[PDB]
């Protein structure tokens, strides 16, 4: 396929140097430019610079100019972004686009490289069991969940009864009380199944090699 | 930089319906060379933009009969004709008529459904949470439509905002309702010095609030 293929996701403590490659195969590299585009957490898909290959000169929008460094190795077809001394706010996903000289669009984009800049060290989570302040018969369903809190890094994988409870579960996105993450999940079961039959939340956080099974026990 | 602005943010649609996205611009996009560089990207879930339409009205290739576009200078509009399972995503308009090419916000093409108010559940803080110090309190507001709700956390009666970290889910592919949940955190004893903790949800489908609770 004619595609720009880019490198792995990475994790950098601030004040560091990360270098993103982007390799063009299947197309005449010299004939289009590779434009870098940024996706910040729910900020602007903002444009960074451009590297024109017939010359090897870069243009920058003013913001990233200079601290951000594009580069090239044409007999390899690969493009480069280096971010030096990355701030925390240098946490986004970075994309490279084949940009065209004729109608001026961006038509082949690569998957993106996520850079996570954080000071944190990996901690395993605290899975905590959430069972209900004895609401009754709230109609005919019970809802319990787990609060797997305080982990670094993402991801964790939550499940219940080893995967046997899926309609009903709703794991909500991971948010950041102070450097680490907090995550939680909900399973709604029929009222004759809890506490008759057991409900366990199983959470594994791979970047620490921990699995915690928490059985949801009445109160 | 040239500002590009979109309306709506979420566009609820009935699959098989008509659907129209609209986009507008700060400066004008007609160029010294009598050309308009207004292009439209679509970003499907956790993925990469794919150019759909260029220079206002021309599609890219692959792209089908269903897509279309128009307008000039300051104002442009896209339109799908029979919106389908395969068209939902964010939808970005950008301009290349200027420097720096600016991107434009987006509108997700979500699904519209008959409404639902949120099933809520207050859960007290646990043995171990307490044995570590710290006690999070959690309200799951669940399976509701539509997206806007919001959660007061009344604490005796006087309300609160330290701690309350809220999080939300995307549209439940299986039933199109949403879910959301706030976690209030209080130290084990900012916790052990109050009765009555109540998250209060306000959402369209009840003129009244919808308030679960428990007494410490
Ligand atoms: C070849 C290429 O990648 C294209 C894609 C988008 C294009 C730019 C879009 C903005 C623009 C407006 C101009 O009138 C000067 C040229 C520039 C600066 C274009 C130069 C060529 C670009 C960078």
mmCIF file with all atom_site columns, C-alpha atoms in Angstrom, chain A residues 35 37-39 43-47 59-63 95 97-98 102-112 127-135 138 143-147 149 166-177 182 184-188 214 219, chain B residues 1 4 31 33 37 39 41 43 47-51 54-55 60-61 92 96-105 119 121-129 132 136 138 140-143 163 165-169 172 174-175 177-181 183 185 212-214:
data_model
loop_
_atom_site.group_PDB
_atom_site.id
_atom_site.type_symbol
_atom_site.label_atom_id
_atom_site.label_alt_id
_atom_site.label_comp_id
_atom_site.label_asym_id
_atom_site.label_entity_id
_atom_site.label_seq_id
_atom_site.pdbx_PDB_ins_code
_atom_site.Cartn_x
_atom_site.Cartn_y
_atom_site.Cartn_z
_atom_site.occupancy
_atom_site.B_iso_or_equiv
_atom_site.pdbx_formal_charge
_atom_site.auth_seq_id
_atom_site.auth_comp_id
_atom_site.auth_asym_id
_atom_site.auth_atom_id
_atom_site.pdbx_PDB_model_num
ATOM 1   C CA . UNK A 1 35  ? 3.540   18.114 6.982  1.00 0.00 ? 35  UNK A CA 1
ATOM 2   C CA . UNK A 1 37  ? -0.132  17.783 12.427 1.00 0.00 ? 37  UNK A CA 1
ATOM 3   C CA . UNK A 1 38  ? -0.674  17.618 16.266 1.00 0.00 ? 38  UNK A CA 1
ATOM 4   C CA . UNK A 1 39  ? -3.664  16.272 18.225 1.00 0.00 ? 39  UNK A CA 1
ATOM 5   C CA . UNK A 1 43  ? -7.510  20.866 21.788 1.00 0.00 ? 43  UNK A CA 1
ATOM 6   C CA . UNK A 1 44  ? -6.898  21.751 18.192 1.00 0.00 ? 44  UNK A CA 1
ATOM 7   C CA . UNK A 1 45  ? -5.778  19.403 15.501 1.00 0.00 ? 45  UNK A CA 1
ATOM 8   C CA . UNK A 1 46  ? -3.117  22.165 14.968 1.00 0.00 ? 46  UNK A CA 1
ATOM 9   C CA . UNK A 1 47  ? -0.508  22.316 12.170 1.00 0.00 ? 47  UNK A CA 1
ATOM 10  C CA . UNK A 1 59  ? 8.754   25.708 7.510  1.00 0.00 ? 59  UNK A CA 1
ATOM 11  C CA . UNK A 1 60  ? 7.447   26.245 10.875 1.00 0.00 ? 60  UNK A CA 1
ATOM 12  C CA . UNK A 1 61  ? 4.456   27.849 12.159 1.00 0.00 ? 61  UNK A CA 1
ATOM 13  C CA . UNK A 1 62  ? 5.920   30.170 14.796 1.00 0.00 ? 62  UNK A CA 1
ATOM 14  C CA . UNK A 1 63  ? 4.891   28.138 17.867 1.00 0.00 ? 63  UNK A CA 1
ATOM 15  C CA . UNK A 1 95  ? 0.742   12.659 12.618 1.00 0.00 ? 95  UNK A CA 1
ATOM 16  C CA . UNK A 1 97  ? 0.745   14.012 6.160  1.00 0.00 ? 97  UNK A CA 1
ATOM 17  C CA . UNK A 1 98  ? 1.657   13.685 2.525  1.00 0.00 ? 98  UNK A CA 1
ATOM 18  C CA . UNK A 1 102 ? -1.463  21.140 -6.755 1.00 0.00 ? 102 UNK A CA 1
ATOM 19  C CA . UNK A 1 103 ? -4.780  21.305 -4.847 1.00 0.00 ? 103 UNK A CA 1
ATOM 20  C CA . UNK A 1 104 ? -3.111  21.747 -1.441 1.00 0.00 ? 104 UNK A CA 1
ATOM 21  C CA . UNK A 1 105 ? -4.701  19.028 0.662  1.00 0.00 ? 105 UNK A CA 1
ATOM 22  C CA . UNK A 1 106 ? -3.394  16.259 2.940  1.00 0.00 ? 106 UNK A CA 1
ATOM 23  C CA . UNK A 1 107 ? -4.284  12.892 1.534  1.00 0.00 ? 107 UNK A CA 1
ATOM 24  C CA . UNK A 1 108 ? -2.234  10.106 3.176  1.00 0.00 ? 108 UNK A CA 1
ATOM 25  C CA . UNK A 1 109 ? -1.802  10.419 7.002  1.00 0.00 ? 109 UNK A CA 1
ATOM 26  C CA . UNK A 1 110 ? -0.031  7.891  9.214  1.00 0.00 ? 110 UNK A CA 1
ATOM 27  C CA . UNK A 1 111 ? -1.458  6.261  12.374 1.00 0.00 ? 111 UNK A CA 1
ATOM 28  C CA . UNK A 1 112 ? 0.078   8.640  14.859 1.00 0.00 ? 112 UNK A CA 1
ATOM 29  C CA . UNK A 1 127 ? -8.742  -2.009 43.076 1.00 0.00 ? 127 UNK A CA 1
ATOM 30  C CA . UNK A 1 128 ? -11.482 -1.066 45.613 1.00 0.00 ? 128 UNK A CA 1
ATOM 31  C CA . UNK A 1 129 ? -14.937 -2.738 45.650 1.00 0.00 ? 129 UNK A CA 1
ATOM 32  C CA . UNK A 1 130 ? -18.038 -0.540 45.384 1.00 0.00 ? 130 UNK A CA 1
ATOM 33  C CA . UNK A 1 131 ? -21.174 -2.287 46.851 1.00 0.00 ? 131 UNK A CA 1
ATOM 34  C CA . UNK A 1 132 ? -24.443 -0.391 47.398 1.00 0.00 ? 132 UNK A CA 1
ATOM 35  C CA . UNK A 1 133 ? -25.483 1.732  50.460 1.00 0.00 ? 133 UNK A CA 1
ATOM 36  C CA . UNK A 1 134 ? -28.441 -0.618 50.829 1.00 0.00 ? 134 UNK A CA 1
ATOM 37  C CA . UNK A 1 135 ? -30.777 0.736  48.391 1.00 0.00 ? 135 UNK A CA 1
ATOM 38  C CA . UNK A 1 138 ? -34.321 0.069  43.096 1.00 0.00 ? 138 UNK A CA 1
ATOM 39  C CA . UNK A 1 143 ? -25.453 -1.874 40.188 1.00 0.00 ? 143 UNK A CA 1
ATOM 40  C CA . UNK A 1 144 ? -22.058 -2.303 41.709 1.00 0.00 ? 144 UNK A CA 1
ATOM 41  C CA . UNK A 1 145 ? -18.596 -1.349 40.414 1.00 0.00 ? 145 UNK A CA 1
ATOM 42  C CA . UNK A 1 146 ? -14.821 -1.201 41.152 1.00 0.00 ? 146 UNK A CA 1
ATOM 43  C CA . UNK A 1 147 ? -12.660 1.899  41.635 1.00 0.00 ? 147 UNK A CA 1
ATOM 44  C CA . UNK A 1 149 ? -7.331  3.889  41.580 1.00 0.00 ? 149 UNK A CA 1
ATOM 45  C CA . UNK A 1 166 ? -20.328 -7.801 29.335 1.00 0.00 ? 166 UNK A CA 1
ATOM 46  C CA . UNK A 1 167 ? -23.872 -6.348 28.560 1.00 0.00 ? 167 UNK A CA 1
ATOM 47  C CA . UNK A 1 168 ? -24.253 -4.012 31.495 1.00 0.00 ? 168 UNK A CA 1
ATOM 48  C CA . UNK A 1 169 ? -20.571 -3.144 32.087 1.00 0.00 ? 169 UNK A CA 1
ATOM 49  C CA . UNK A 1 170 ? -19.509 0.411  31.462 1.00 0.00 ? 170 UNK A CA 1
ATOM 50  C CA . UNK A 1 171 ? -15.905 1.176  32.166 1.00 0.00 ? 171 UNK A CA 1
ATOM 51  C CA . UNK A 1 172 ? -15.473 5.005  32.153 1.00 0.00 ? 172 UNK A CA 1
ATOM 52  C CA . UNK A 1 173 ? -12.241 6.726  30.960 1.00 0.00 ? 173 UNK A CA 1
ATOM 53  C CA . UNK A 1 174 ? -9.183  7.245  32.979 1.00 0.00 ? 174 UNK A CA 1
ATOM 54  C CA . UNK A 1 175 ? -8.629  10.711 34.417 1.00 0.00 ? 175 UNK A CA 1
ATOM 55  C CA . UNK A 1 176 ? -5.728  12.228 36.439 1.00 0.00 ? 176 UNK A CA 1
ATOM 56  C CA . UNK A 1 177 ? -5.821  12.978 40.181 1.00 0.00 ? 177 UNK A CA 1
ATOM 57  C CA . UNK A 1 182 ? -8.033  6.809  38.520 1.00 0.00 ? 182 UNK A CA 1
ATOM 58  C CA . UNK A 1 184 ? -13.846 2.804  37.503 1.00 0.00 ? 184 UNK A CA 1
ATOM 59  C CA . UNK A 1 185 ? -16.291 0.294  35.993 1.00 0.00 ? 185 UNK A CA 1
ATOM 60  C CA . UNK A 1 186 ? -20.065 -0.578 36.634 1.00 0.00 ? 186 UNK A CA 1
ATOM 61  C CA . UNK A 1 187 ? -21.969 -3.858 36.124 1.00 0.00 ? 187 UNK A CA 1
ATOM 62  C CA . UNK A 1 188 ? -25.671 -3.977 36.417 1.00 0.00 ? 188 UNK A CA 1
ATOM 63  C CA . UNK A 1 214 ? -12.072 -8.243 43.835 1.00 0.00 ? 214 UNK A CA 1
ATOM 64  C CA . UNK A 1 219 ? -23.190 -4.163 52.190 1.00 0.00 ? 219 UNK A CA 1
ATOM 65  C CA . UNK B 2 1   ? -3.827  32.363 12.331 1.00 0.00 ? 1   UNK B CA 1
ATOM 66  C CA . UNK B 2 4   ? -12.307 27.933 11.482 1.00 0.00 ? 4   UNK B CA 1
ATOM 67  C CA . UNK B 2 31  ? -7.270  32.998 -3.379 1.00 0.00 ? 31  UNK B CA 1
ATOM 68  C CA . UNK B 2 33  ? -5.305  32.481 -8.110 1.00 0.00 ? 33  UNK B CA 1
ATOM 69  C CA . UNK B 2 37  ? -8.821  25.603 -0.632 1.00 0.00 ? 37  UNK B CA 1
ATOM 70  C CA . UNK B 2 39  ? -11.241 20.575 2.439  1.00 0.00 ? 39  UNK B CA 1
ATOM 71  C CA . UNK B 2 41  ? -11.587 15.322 6.902  1.00 0.00 ? 41  UNK B CA 1
ATOM 72  C CA . UNK B 2 43  ? -11.943 10.883 11.902 1.00 0.00 ? 43  UNK B CA 1
ATOM 73  C CA . UNK B 2 47  ? -8.016  6.503  14.146 1.00 0.00 ? 47  UNK B CA 1
ATOM 74  C CA . UNK B 2 48  ? -6.556  8.908  11.510 1.00 0.00 ? 48  UNK B CA 1
ATOM 75  C CA . UNK B 2 49  ? -8.232  11.646 9.291  1.00 0.00 ? 49  UNK B CA 1
ATOM 76  C CA . UNK B 2 50  ? -8.976  10.670 5.650  1.00 0.00 ? 50  UNK B CA 1
ATOM 77  C CA . UNK B 2 51  ? -9.555  13.586 3.122  1.00 0.00 ? 51  UNK B CA 1
ATOM 78  C CA . UNK B 2 54  ? -11.443 19.185 -1.703 1.00 0.00 ? 54  UNK B CA 1
ATOM 79  C CA . UNK B 2 55  ? -11.779 22.661 -3.059 1.00 0.00 ? 55  UNK B CA 1
ATOM 80  C CA . UNK B 2 60  ? -11.702 12.465 -2.966 1.00 0.00 ? 60  UNK B CA 1
ATOM 81  C CA . UNK B 2 61  ? -11.750 8.963  -4.569 1.00 0.00 ? 61  UNK B CA 1
ATOM 82  C CA . UNK B 2 92  ? -13.207 18.419 10.420 1.00 0.00 ? 92  UNK B CA 1
ATOM 83  C CA . UNK B 2 96  ? -5.279  25.642 2.864  1.00 0.00 ? 96  UNK B CA 1
ATOM 84  C CA . UNK B 2 97  ? -5.900  29.079 1.263  1.00 0.00 ? 97  UNK B CA 1
ATOM 85  C CA . UNK B 2 98  ? -3.715  30.585 4.021  1.00 0.00 ? 98  UNK B CA 1
ATOM 86  C CA . UNK B 2 99  ? -0.757  30.141 6.365  1.00 0.00 ? 99  UNK B CA 1
ATOM 87  C CA . UNK B 2 100 ? -0.941  28.612 8.733  1.00 0.00 ? 100 UNK B CA 1
ATOM 88  C CA . UNK B 2 101 ? -3.531  26.036 7.333  1.00 0.00 ? 101 UNK B CA 1
ATOM 89  C CA . UNK B 2 102 ? -5.978  25.867 10.122 1.00 0.00 ? 102 UNK B CA 1
ATOM 90  C CA . UNK B 2 103 ? -8.092  23.107 11.220 1.00 0.00 ? 103 UNK B CA 1
ATOM 91  C CA . UNK B 2 104 ? -11.666 23.377 12.275 1.00 0.00 ? 104 UNK B CA 1
ATOM 92  C CA . UNK B 2 105 ? -13.026 21.812 15.453 1.00 0.00 ? 105 UNK B CA 1
ATOM 93  C CA . UNK B 2 119 ? -30.287 5.596  36.352 1.00 0.00 ? 119 UNK B CA 1
ATOM 94  C CA . UNK B 2 121 ? -26.321 4.912  42.262 1.00 0.00 ? 121 UNK B CA 1
ATOM 95  C CA . UNK B 2 122 ? -24.494 6.439  45.230 1.00 0.00 ? 122 UNK B CA 1
ATOM 96  C CA . UNK B 2 123 ? -21.891 4.053  46.700 1.00 0.00 ? 123 UNK B CA 1
ATOM 97  C CA . UNK B 2 124 ? -20.271 4.722  50.137 1.00 0.00 ? 124 UNK B CA 1
ATOM 98  C CA . UNK B 2 125 ? -16.411 4.467  50.638 1.00 0.00 ? 125 UNK B CA 1
ATOM 99  C CA . UNK B 2 126 ? -14.967 1.141  51.460 1.00 0.00 ? 126 UNK B CA 1
ATOM 100 C CA . UNK B 2 127 ? -13.040 -0.771 54.245 1.00 0.00 ? 127 UNK B CA 1
ATOM 101 C CA . UNK B 2 128 ? -9.690  -0.560 52.495 1.00 0.00 ? 128 UNK B CA 1
ATOM 102 C CA . UNK B 2 129 ? -10.152 2.947  51.091 1.00 0.00 ? 129 UNK B CA 1
ATOM 103 C CA . UNK B 2 132 ? -5.543  3.779  53.708 1.00 0.00 ? 132 UNK B CA 1
ATOM 104 C CA . UNK B 2 136 ? -13.680 8.424  47.377 1.00 0.00 ? 136 UNK B CA 1
ATOM 105 C CA . UNK B 2 138 ? -18.871 7.571  43.595 1.00 0.00 ? 138 UNK B CA 1
ATOM 106 C CA . UNK B 2 140 ? -22.702 6.426  38.509 1.00 0.00 ? 140 UNK B CA 1
ATOM 107 C CA . UNK B 2 141 ? -25.283 8.410  36.368 1.00 0.00 ? 141 UNK B CA 1
ATOM 108 C CA . UNK B 2 142 ? -26.070 5.749  33.680 1.00 0.00 ? 142 UNK B CA 1
ATOM 109 C CA . UNK B 2 143 ? -27.717 4.687  30.434 1.00 0.00 ? 143 UNK B CA 1
ATOM 110 C CA . UNK B 2 163 ? -12.222 16.356 44.471 1.00 0.00 ? 163 UNK B CA 1
ATOM 111 C CA . UNK B 2 165 ? -13.472 14.527 38.950 1.00 0.00 ? 165 UNK B CA 1
ATOM 112 C CA . UNK B 2 166 ? -16.085 13.601 36.358 1.00 0.00 ? 166 UNK B CA 1
ATOM 113 C CA . UNK B 2 167 ? -15.692 11.216 33.403 1.00 0.00 ? 167 UNK B CA 1
ATOM 114 C CA . UNK B 2 168 ? -17.952 10.199 30.583 1.00 0.00 ? 168 UNK B CA 1
ATOM 115 C CA . UNK B 2 169 ? -18.441 7.386  27.980 1.00 0.00 ? 169 UNK B CA 1
ATOM 116 C CA . UNK B 2 172 ? -23.071 2.986  23.769 1.00 0.00 ? 172 UNK B CA 1
ATOM 117 C CA . UNK B 2 174 ? -25.480 -1.309 21.715 1.00 0.00 ? 174 UNK B CA 1
ATOM 118 C CA . UNK B 2 175 ? -28.298 1.071  22.836 1.00 0.00 ? 175 UNK B CA 1
ATOM 119 C CA . UNK B 2 177 ? -27.632 5.916  25.618 1.00 0.00 ? 177 UNK B CA 1
ATOM 120 C CA . UNK B 2 178 ? -24.667 7.465  27.472 1.00 0.00 ? 178 UNK B CA 1
ATOM 121 C CA . UNK B 2 179 ? -23.159 6.883  30.962 1.00 0.00 ? 179 UNK B CA 1
ATOM 122 C CA . UNK B 2 180 ? -21.113 9.066  33.217 1.00 0.00 ? 180 UNK B CA 1
ATOM 123 C CA . UNK B 2 181 ? -19.800 8.936  36.851 1.00 0.00 ? 181 UNK B CA 1
ATOM 124 C CA . UNK B 2 183 ? -15.762 10.477 42.033 1.00 0.00 ? 183 UNK B CA 1
ATOM 125 C CA . UNK B 2 185 ? -12.614 12.498 47.079 1.00 0.00 ? 185 UNK B CA 1
ATOM 126 C CA . UNK B 2 212 ? -29.422 9.702  45.265 1.00 0.00 ? 212 UNK B CA 1
ATOM 127 C CA . UNK B 2 213 ? -27.854 9.814  48.671 1.00 0.00 ? 213 UNK B CA 1
ATOM 128 C CA . UNK B 2 214 ? -26.683 8.022  51.838 1.00 0.00 ? 214 UNK B CA 1
#
